[PDB]
Amino acid sequence: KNVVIYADGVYDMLHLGHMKQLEQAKKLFENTTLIVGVTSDNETKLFKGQVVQTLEERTETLKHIRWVDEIISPCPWVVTPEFLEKYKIDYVAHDEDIYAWLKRAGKFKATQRTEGVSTTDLIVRILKNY
Amino acid sequence: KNVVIYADGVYDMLHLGHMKQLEQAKKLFENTTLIVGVTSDNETKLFKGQVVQTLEERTETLKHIRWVDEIISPCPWVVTPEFLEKYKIDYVAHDEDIYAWLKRAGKFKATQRTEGVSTTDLIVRILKNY
Ligand SMILES: C[N+](C)(C)CCO
Ligand SMILES: C[N+](C)(C)CCO
């Protein structure tokens, strides 16, 4: 009955948006193991942009999140069929379609982001006292 | 065997320091229920200073933290013996001694903060790119 879900991401400066997304992945089925992959500093910088926290800081924060059962840190940047078999993953949960092969296989589960609840959004709020 | 631990706080812009403190309270005994009290916006402002996030935002974030079993939100500003009996609390976990009566009763458990890992510390890091 237990279903293995994989979610990957940067998880820089973890906020409520991240946490709700993790909750959503965790609750996709009645009985789940949520594995979370945390991307490397170098690959994140190269492919995505700047990152504030190190891999160690981003991983250690995630350890405290209720929905997270296992962490793969660092995780590969690109998910492969080999990776799914290596970790016995049943579904990939995520927000030229990179995920097309996952959808064809029936292994893709959509989750959603939450806007306006960002870490950076809170500084904007602090500054509107001046 | 189950021991009820109470920790209260503001938990504004929750960071790794908060989370480690919650972990420490949760792990004080083998079998615990950690109840976390979240202080009101008005009492926090009056007695302590500015707060960035609302009670709702601070409470909702805490819901996602692994170590948190129950939340009292808002919680009273000052812990009383009546409150301990109301919620059947065995120990109060915290960082003119306000907590002297708790120590005399054998109901006080010390925990520790973590410095330099603050939310605000991370903005300082972002700005040292300019
Ligand atoms: C979205 N990718 C899987 C390509 C990178 C990690 O988030
Ligand atoms: C420390 N007090 C209990 C007085 C307020 C909440 O943190």
mmCIF file of C-alpha atoms and ligand atoms in Angstrom:
data_model
loop_
_atom_site.group_PDB
_atom_site.id
_atom_site.type_symbol
_atom_site.label_atom_id
_atom_site.label_comp_id
_atom_site.label_asym_id
_atom_site.label_seq_id
_atom_site.Cartn_x
_atom_site.Cartn_y
_atom_site.Cartn_z
ATOM 1 C CA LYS A 1 0.000 0.000 0.000
ATOM 2 C CA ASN A 2 2.991 2.328 0.530
ATOM 3 C CA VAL A 3 3.769 4.642 -2.395
ATOM 4 C CA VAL A 4 7.140 6.337 -2.909
ATOM 5 C CA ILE A 5 6.903 9.967 -4.001
ATOM 6 C CA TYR A 6 9.886 12.019 -5.130
ATOM 7 C CA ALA A 7 10.024 15.813 -5.124
ATOM 8 C CA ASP A 8 13.138 17.736 -6.036
ATOM 9 C CA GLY A 9 13.985 21.389 -5.736
ATOM 10 C CA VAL A 10 16.399 24.020 -4.517
ATOM 11 C CA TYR A 11 14.524 24.768 -1.281
ATOM 12 C CA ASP A 12 16.463 28.018 -0.796
ATOM 13 C CA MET A 13 15.263 30.039 2.245
ATOM 14 C CA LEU A 14 12.408 27.608 2.889
ATOM 15 C CA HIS A 15 8.980 29.214 3.238
ATOM 16 C CA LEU A 16 5.303 28.356 3.600
ATOM 17 C CA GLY A 17 5.015 27.902 -0.172
ATOM 18 C CA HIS A 18 7.641 25.131 -0.129
ATOM 19 C CA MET A 19 6.090 23.546 2.893
ATOM 20 C CA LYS A 20 2.578 23.403 1.441
ATOM 21 C CA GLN A 21 3.986 21.847 -1.723
ATOM 22 C CA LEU A 22 5.782 19.201 0.319
ATOM 23 C CA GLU A 23 2.562 18.607 2.256
ATOM 24 C CA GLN A 24 0.700 18.169 -1.006
ATOM 25 C CA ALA A 25 3.205 15.621 -2.339
ATOM 26 C CA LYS A 26 3.146 13.747 0.974
ATOM 27 C CA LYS A 27 -0.651 13.529 0.925
ATOM 28 C CA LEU A 28 -1.021 12.348 -2.689
ATOM 29 C CA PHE A 29 -1.953 8.861 -1.439
ATOM 30 C CA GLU A 30 -3.094 7.465 1.894
ATOM 31 C CA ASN A 31 0.279 5.836 2.615
ATOM 32 C CA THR A 32 3.409 7.502 1.242
ATOM 33 C CA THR A 33 7.127 7.860 1.640
ATOM 34 C CA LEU A 34 8.118 11.330 0.482
ATOM 35 C CA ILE A 35 11.696 11.505 -0.709
ATOM 36 C CA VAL A 36 12.958 15.044 -1.269
ATOM 37 C CA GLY A 37 15.932 15.784 -3.510
ATOM 38 C CA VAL A 38 17.960 18.908 -2.821
ATOM 39 C CA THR A 39 19.912 20.347 -5.756
ATOM 40 C CA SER A 40 23.671 21.094 -5.595
ATOM 41 C CA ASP A 41 24.965 24.662 -5.262
ATOM 42 C CA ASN A 42 26.905 24.506 -8.528
ATOM 43 C CA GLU A 43 24.202 23.003 -10.706
ATOM 44 C CA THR A 44 21.634 25.384 -9.231
ATOM 45 C CA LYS A 45 23.843 28.412 -9.976
ATOM 46 C CA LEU A 46 24.679 27.222 -13.484
ATOM 47 C CA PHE A 47 21.176 26.236 -14.576
ATOM 48 C CA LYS A 48 18.845 28.362 -12.450
ATOM 49 C CA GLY A 49 20.492 31.349 -10.813
ATOM 50 C CA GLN A 50 21.723 32.618 -7.479
ATOM 51 C CA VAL A 51 21.194 30.686 -4.267
ATOM 52 C CA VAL A 52 21.439 32.192 -0.804
ATOM 53 C CA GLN A 53 21.909 29.144 1.382
ATOM 54 C CA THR A 54 24.417 26.362 0.984
ATOM 55 C CA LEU A 55 23.456 22.774 0.310
ATOM 56 C CA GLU A 56 24.104 21.974 3.971
ATOM 57 C CA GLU A 57 21.815 24.769 5.217
ATOM 58 C CA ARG A 58 19.026 23.974 2.760
ATOM 59 C CA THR A 59 19.206 20.244 3.609
ATOM 60 C CA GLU A 60 19.348 20.749 7.370
ATOM 61 C CA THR A 61 16.264 22.961 7.338
ATOM 62 C CA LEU A 62 14.292 20.337 5.376
ATOM 63 C CA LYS A 63 15.109 17.785 8.008
ATOM 64 C CA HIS A 64 12.735 19.644 10.344
ATOM 65 C CA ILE A 65 9.739 19.522 8.044
ATOM 66 C CA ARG A 66 6.987 17.107 9.055
ATOM 67 C CA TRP A 67 6.180 15.790 5.567
ATOM 68 C CA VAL A 68 9.751 14.857 4.629
ATOM 69 C CA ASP A 69 10.522 11.193 5.072
ATOM 70 C CA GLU A 70 13.877 10.924 3.283
ATOM 71 C CA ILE A 71 16.325 13.374 1.736
ATOM 72 C CA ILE A 72 18.676 12.852 -1.194
ATOM 73 C CA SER A 73 21.301 15.594 -0.959
ATOM 74 C CA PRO A 74 22.703 16.467 -3.341
ATOM 75 C CA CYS A 75 20.219 15.066 -5.860
ATOM 76 C CA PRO A 76 20.863 14.868 -9.610
ATOM 77 C CA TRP A 77 19.667 17.846 -11.628
ATOM 78 C CA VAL A 78 17.768 15.723 -14.130
ATOM 79 C CA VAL A 79 15.512 12.825 -13.203
ATOM 80 C CA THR A 80 16.170 9.585 -15.143
ATOM 81 C CA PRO A 81 14.368 6.220 -15.373
ATOM 82 C CA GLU A 82 17.461 4.646 -13.777
ATOM 83 C CA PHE A 83 17.077 6.993 -10.806
ATOM 84 C CA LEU A 84 13.434 5.969 -10.346
ATOM 85 C CA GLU A 85 14.417 2.319 -10.245
ATOM 86 C CA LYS A 86 17.440 2.979 -8.034
ATOM 87 C CA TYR A 87 15.213 4.507 -5.350
ATOM 88 C CA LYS A 88 12.050 2.524 -6.183
ATOM 89 C CA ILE A 89 10.127 5.731 -6.814
ATOM 90 C CA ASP A 90 6.485 5.401 -7.906
ATOM 91 C CA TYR A 91 5.635 9.054 -8.713
ATOM 92 C CA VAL A 92 7.469 12.313 -9.265
ATOM 93 C CA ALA A 93 5.717 15.354 -7.824
ATOM 94 C CA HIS A 94 6.378 18.721 -9.453
ATOM 95 C CA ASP A 95 4.786 22.140 -9.955
ATOM 96 C CA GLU A 96 10.191 20.971 -24.710
ATOM 97 C CA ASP A 97 8.517 19.289 -21.719
ATOM 98 C CA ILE A 98 11.158 17.797 -19.403
ATOM 99 C CA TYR A 99 8.444 15.844 -17.584
ATOM 100 C CA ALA A 100 6.703 14.459 -20.705
ATOM 101 C CA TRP A 101 8.276 11.011 -20.345
ATOM 102 C CA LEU A 102 7.028 10.895 -16.749
ATOM 103 C CA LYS A 103 3.457 11.727 -17.825
ATOM 104 C CA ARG A 104 3.551 9.061 -20.592
ATOM 105 C CA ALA A 105 4.557 6.507 -17.975
ATOM 106 C CA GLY A 106 1.809 7.563 -15.553
ATOM 107 C CA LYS A 107 4.428 8.583 -12.967
ATOM 108 C CA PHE A 108 3.882 12.338 -12.885
ATOM 109 C CA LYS A 109 1.880 14.029 -10.118
ATOM 110 C CA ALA A 110 1.177 17.755 -10.308
ATOM 111 C CA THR A 111 1.502 19.981 -7.240
ATOM 112 C CA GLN A 112 1.051 23.772 -6.945
ATOM 113 C CA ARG A 113 3.075 26.743 -5.711
ATOM 114 C CA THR A 114 1.871 29.475 -3.356
ATOM 115 C CA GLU A 115 2.681 33.079 -4.299
ATOM 116 C CA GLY A 116 3.223 36.149 -2.107
ATOM 117 C CA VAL A 117 4.329 34.092 0.879
ATOM 118 C CA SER A 118 8.022 34.205 -0.024
ATOM 119 C CA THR A 119 10.971 34.924 2.274
ATOM 120 C CA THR A 120 11.823 37.974 0.181
ATOM 121 C CA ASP A 121 8.193 39.135 0.398
ATOM 122 C CA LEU A 122 8.618 39.532 4.158
ATOM 123 C CA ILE A 123 11.506 41.971 3.858
ATOM 124 C CA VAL A 124 9.353 44.168 1.604
ATOM 125 C CA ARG A 125 6.904 44.213 4.501
ATOM 126 C CA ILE A 126 9.597 45.238 6.999
ATOM 127 C CA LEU A 127 10.708 48.113 4.801
ATOM 128 C CA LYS A 128 7.220 49.620 4.489
ATOM 129 C CA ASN A 129 7.708 51.077 7.977
ATOM 130 C CA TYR A 130 9.888 53.829 6.503
ATOM 131 C CA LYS B 1 5.358 7.119 29.970
ATOM 132 C CA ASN B 2 4.210 10.092 27.852
ATOM 133 C CA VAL B 3 5.419 13.496 29.063
ATOM 134 C CA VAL B 4 3.783 16.792 28.081
ATOM 135 C CA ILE B 5 6.246 19.562 27.255
ATOM 136 C CA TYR B 6 5.231 23.172 26.687
ATOM 137 C CA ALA B 7 7.299 25.722 24.780
ATOM 138 C CA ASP B 8 6.068 29.216 24.069
ATOM 139 C CA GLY B 9 7.437 31.935 21.859
ATOM 140 C CA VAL B 10 6.806 34.434 19.103
ATOM 141 C CA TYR B 11 8.179 32.243 16.299
ATOM 142 C CA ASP B 12 8.410 35.235 13.944
ATOM 143 C CA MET B 13 10.008 34.358 10.559
ATOM 144 C CA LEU B 14 10.786 30.815 11.706
ATOM 145 C CA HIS B 15 14.392 29.720 11.204
ATOM 146 C CA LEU B 16 16.780 26.869 11.953
ATOM 147 C CA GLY B 17 17.399 28.276 15.440
ATOM 148 C CA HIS B 18 13.698 27.955 16.323
ATOM 149 C CA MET B 19 13.509 24.536 14.801
ATOM 150 C CA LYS B 20 16.488 23.145 16.713
ATOM 151 C CA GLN B 21 15.011 24.505 19.936
ATOM 152 C CA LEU B 22 11.703 22.801 19.197
ATOM 153 C CA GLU B 23 13.606 19.605 18.396
ATOM 154 C CA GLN B 24 15.406 19.865 21.711
ATOM 155 C CA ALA B 25 12.167 20.303 23.677
ATOM 156 C CA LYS B 26 10.567 17.407 21.793
ATOM 157 C CA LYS B 27 13.489 15.108 22.597
ATOM 158 C CA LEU B 28 13.730 15.914 26.323
ATOM 159 C CA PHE B 29 12.257 12.487 27.145
ATOM 160 C CA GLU B 30 11.796 9.271 25.194
ATOM 161 C CA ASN B 31 8.036 9.790 24.806
ATOM 162 C CA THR B 32 6.724 13.353 24.612
ATOM 163 C CA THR B 33 3.886 15.525 23.456
ATOM 164 C CA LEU B 34 5.285 18.930 22.553
ATOM 165 C CA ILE B 35 2.727 21.688 22.865
ATOM 166 C CA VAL B 36 3.846 24.998 21.373
ATOM 167 C CA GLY B 37 2.276 28.298 22.403
ATOM 168 C CA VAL B 38 2.329 31.157 19.920
ATOM 169 C CA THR B 39 2.098 34.670 21.371
ATOM 170 C CA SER B 40 -0.509 37.236 20.218
ATOM 171 C CA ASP B 41 0.447 40.141 17.945
ATOM 172 C CA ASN B 42 -0.633 42.771 20.470
ATOM 173 C CA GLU B 43 1.042 41.316 23.534
ATOM 174 C CA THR B 44 4.211 40.664 21.541
ATOM 175 C CA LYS B 45 4.310 44.275 20.295
ATOM 176 C CA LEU B 46 3.562 45.716 23.729
ATOM 177 C CA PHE B 47 5.987 43.602 25.750
ATOM 178 C CA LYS B 48 8.707 42.597 23.287
ATOM 179 C CA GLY B 49 8.823 44.680 20.131
ATOM 180 C CA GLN B 50 7.993 44.563 16.452
ATOM 181 C CA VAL B 51 6.753 41.410 14.764
ATOM 182 C CA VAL B 52 6.826 40.818 11.027
ATOM 183 C CA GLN B 53 4.324 38.018 10.594
ATOM 184 C CA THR B 54 0.787 37.842 11.878
ATOM 185 C CA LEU B 55 -0.388 35.285 14.394
ATOM 186 C CA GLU B 56 -1.997 33.323 11.561
ATOM 187 C CA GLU B 57 1.226 33.214 9.510
ATOM 188 C CA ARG B 58 3.424 32.310 12.476
ATOM 189 C CA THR B 59 0.992 29.561 13.569
ATOM 190 C CA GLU B 60 0.521 28.109 10.091
ATOM 191 C CA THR B 61 4.265 27.797 9.554
ATOM 192 C CA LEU B 62 4.674 25.925 12.864
ATOM 193 C CA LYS B 63 2.101 23.427 11.745
ATOM 194 C CA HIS B 64 4.667 22.120 9.244
ATOM 195 C CA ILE B 65 7.391 21.458 11.779
ATOM 196 C CA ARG B 66 8.032 17.802 12.586
ATOM 197 C CA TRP B 67 8.522 18.207 16.348
ATOM 198 C CA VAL B 68 5.290 20.114 16.994
ATOM 199 C CA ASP B 69 2.492 17.949 18.298
ATOM 200 C CA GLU B 70 -0.040 20.586 19.377
ATOM 201 C CA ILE B 71 -0.325 24.355 19.060
ATOM 202 C CA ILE B 72 -2.002 26.815 21.410
ATOM 203 C CA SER B 73 -2.569 29.994 19.400
ATOM 204 C CA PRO B 74 -2.780 32.548 20.756
ATOM 205 C CA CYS B 75 -1.163 31.455 24.022
ATOM 206 C CA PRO B 76 -1.146 33.552 27.203
ATOM 207 C CA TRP B 77 1.868 35.806 27.653
ATOM 208 C CA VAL B 78 2.599 34.570 31.161
ATOM 209 C CA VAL B 79 2.581 30.926 32.195
ATOM 210 C CA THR B 80 0.528 30.152 35.338
ATOM 211 C CA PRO B 81 0.076 27.037 37.510
ATOM 212 C CA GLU B 82 -3.578 26.997 36.397
ATOM 213 C CA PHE B 83 -2.433 26.835 32.772
ATOM 214 C CA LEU B 84 -0.185 23.848 33.514
ATOM 215 C CA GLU B 85 -3.086 21.983 35.066
ATOM 216 C CA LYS B 86 -5.506 23.055 32.336
ATOM 217 C CA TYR B 87 -3.309 21.444 29.677
ATOM 218 C CA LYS B 88 -1.772 18.746 31.912
ATOM 219 C CA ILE B 89 1.717 20.045 31.193
ATOM 220 C CA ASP B 90 4.630 18.279 32.913
ATOM 221 C CA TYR B 91 7.547 20.572 31.938
ATOM 222 C CA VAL B 92 8.047 24.023 30.479
ATOM 223 C CA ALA B 93 10.947 24.287 28.048
ATOM 224 C CA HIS B 94 12.632 27.667 27.654
ATOM 225 C CA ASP B 95 15.956 29.230 26.663
ATOM 226 C CA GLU B 96 13.499 38.877 38.878
ATOM 227 C CA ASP B 97 13.358 35.338 37.451
ATOM 228 C CA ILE B 98 9.988 34.737 35.763
ATOM 229 C CA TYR B 99 10.726 31.004 35.648
ATOM 230 C CA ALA B 100 11.861 30.646 39.291
ATOM 231 C CA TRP B 101 8.560 29.124 40.421
ATOM 232 C CA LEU B 102 8.873 26.550 37.631
ATOM 233 C CA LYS B 103 12.394 25.574 38.749
ATOM 234 C CA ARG B 104 11.265 25.261 42.410
ATOM 235 C CA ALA B 105 8.542 22.877 41.273
ATOM 236 C CA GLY B 106 10.930 20.789 39.160
ATOM 237 C CA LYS B 107 8.975 21.678 36.002
ATOM 238 C CA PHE B 108 11.555 23.771 34.167
ATOM 239 C CA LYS B 109 13.652 22.355 31.318
ATOM 240 C CA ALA B 110 16.387 24.474 29.756
ATOM 241 C CA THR B 111 16.877 24.593 25.985
ATOM 242 C CA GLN B 112 19.365 26.659 23.935
ATOM 243 C CA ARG B 113 19.239 29.148 21.065
ATOM 244 C CA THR B 114 21.366 29.071 17.914
ATOM 245 C CA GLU B 115 22.950 32.353 16.794
ATOM 246 C CA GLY B 116 23.902 33.581 13.313
ATOM 247 C CA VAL B 117 21.321 31.396 11.598
ATOM 248 C CA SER B 118 18.586 34.039 11.675
ATOM 249 C CA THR B 119 16.243 35.063 8.855
ATOM 250 C CA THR B 120 17.674 38.577 8.981
ATOM 251 C CA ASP B 121 21.208 37.141 8.846
ATOM 252 C CA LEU B 122 20.449 35.783 5.374
ATOM 253 C CA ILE B 123 19.590 39.180 3.926
ATOM 254 C CA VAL B 124 22.963 40.493 5.128
ATOM 255 C CA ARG B 125 24.450 37.681 3.060
ATOM 256 C CA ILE B 126 22.454 38.659 -0.038
ATOM 257 C CA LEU B 127 23.594 42.260 0.219
ATOM 258 C CA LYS B 128 27.304 41.394 0.338
ATOM 259 C CA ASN B 129 27.150 40.897 -3.437
ATOM 260 C CA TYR B 130 27.240 44.673 -3.919
HETATM 261 C C1 LIG C 1 13.351 21.156 -12.210
HETATM 262 N N1 LIG C 1 14.597 20.371 -12.282
HETATM 263 C C2 LIG C 1 14.301 18.971 -11.902
HETATM 264 C C3 LIG C 1 15.079 20.405 -13.673
HETATM 265 C C4 LIG C 1 15.678 20.872 -11.387
HETATM 266 C C5 LIG C 1 15.406 20.792 -9.865
HETATM 267 O O1 LIG C 1 14.272 21.550 -9.411
HETATM 268 C C1 LIG C 2 8.924 34.624 27.597
HETATM 269 N N1 LIG C 2 7.489 34.864 27.833
HETATM 270 C C2 LIG C 2 6.856 33.594 28.253
HETATM 271 C C3 LIG C 2 7.362 35.852 28.917
HETATM 272 C C4 LIG C 2 6.757 35.368 26.636
HETATM 273 C C5 LIG C 2 6.667 34.406 25.427
HETATM 274 O O1 LIG C 2 7.931 34.025 24.860
#
